[PDB]
Amino acid sequence: MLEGKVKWFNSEKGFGFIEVEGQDDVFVHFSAIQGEGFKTLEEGQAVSFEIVEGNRGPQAANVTKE
Ligand SMILES: [Mg+2]
């Protein structure tokens, strides 16, 4: 599991980016967010996650707030 923080997140639509030091930002969709409740993220939130890549390119998976 990779570590980063939320660069920004559009809570209305439910997407944004995780920034990772020395690496490309990673797109994150609300559907990747683990845990209970309304799936959202705040700018600056630490997260652990994986990067999953299919034909659409890499995005975050298994995102847990840290
Ligand atoms: Mg950067």
Swiss-Prot record:
Alphabetical UniProt keywords: Activator, Cytoplasm, DNA-binding, Stress response, Transcription, Transcription regulation
Gene3D superfamilies found in the cross-reference section: 6.20.370.130, Nucleic acid-binding proteins (2.40.50.140)
A Gene Ontology term for the protein's cellular component: nucleoid
Top-level lineage group: Bacteria
PROSITE patterns documented for this protein: CSD_1 (PS00352), CSD_2 (PS51857)
Effect listed in the UniProt record for changing residue 17 to L: In strain: Globigii
Principal localisation: cytoplasm
Keyword Nucleus belongs to the record: no
Effect of disrupting the coding gene: A double cshB-cspB disruption mutant cannot be made.
BP-aspect Gene Ontology terms: regulation of gene expression
InterPro entries in the cross-refs: Cold_shock_CspA (IPR012156), Cold_shock_domain (IPR050181), CSD (IPR011129), CSD_CS (IPR019844), CSP_DNA-bd (IPR002059), NA-bd_OB-fold (IPR012340)
Residues of the CSD domain: 4-63
Result, substituting residue 44 to S: In strain: Globigii
Subcellular location per the Swiss-Prot or TrEMBL entry: Cytoplasm, Nucleoid
SMART domains referenced in this protein's UniProt entry, alphabetically: CSP (SM00357)
Pfam families to which the protein is assigned, alphabetical: CSD (PF00313)
Induction: In response to low temperature.
CDD domains (alphabetical): CSP_CDS
Molecular function in Gene Ontology: DNA binding; nucleic acid binding
Task performed by this protein: Binds to the pentamer sequences ATTGG and CCAAT with highest affinity in single-stranded DNA, and also to other sequences. Has greater affinity for ATTGG than CCAAT. Can act as transcriptional activator of cold shock genes by recognizing putative ATTGG-box elements present in promoter regions of genes induced under cold shock conditions.
Quaternary structure (record): Homodimer. Interacts with RNA helicase CshB when cells are transcriptionally active.
Name of protein: Cold shock protein CspB
Protein source organism: Bacillus subtilis (strain 168)
